[PDB]
Amino acid sequence: AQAFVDATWPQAAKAAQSLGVPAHFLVAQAALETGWGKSQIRNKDGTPSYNLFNIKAGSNWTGKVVEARTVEYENGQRKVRVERFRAYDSYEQAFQDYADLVGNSPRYAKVAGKTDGHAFARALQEGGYATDPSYADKLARVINGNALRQRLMHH
């Protein structure tokens, strides 16, 4: 969606500079995570969580949460459960929380500063960002894809 890129790019820009990566890398990751906004986690009322990166609550997370169905892979096994996800006041808060997490967790140290889409996606995957085995491949295709590119120039 164009509305998705328009709503996220400004907030992506701020967090992207904290991480030393192009803003559209973060828009692409959010688009992959939420199906261009069509599958973003929402409250029971249908209120948006703004959690475009699908970040679960940590054990000591205090603040808004939403219980949501989630799919995870462990070995060649598919898992479906309901977990507590973070909820935010705005896309800005969501992006800032993402930069905080990725920027400060040791396992993602190789992510910051990556300005090639494949290298960025691989660093995330190798850091354990996702359980989907083809996460990096899929993310790289969005980052370098014509769909995102056209929507960016439109933005």
Q: Could you tell me how many residues make up the chain?
A: 155
Q: Which of 45, 83, 92, 97 is catalytic?
A: 97
Distance CA 92, CA 118 (A): 25
Active site residue 97: yes
Q: Are 52 and 91 in contact (CB under 8 A)?
A: yes
Q: Which of 72, 89, 126, 137 is catalytic?
A: 72
Distance CA 57, CA 64 (A): 9
How distant, in Å, are the alpha carbons of 24, 30, 155 from that of 7? 12, 11, 10
Q: Are 117 and 105 in contact (CB under 8 A)?
A: no
Active site residue 132: no
The residues annotated with a catalytic role in the active site are 72, 97
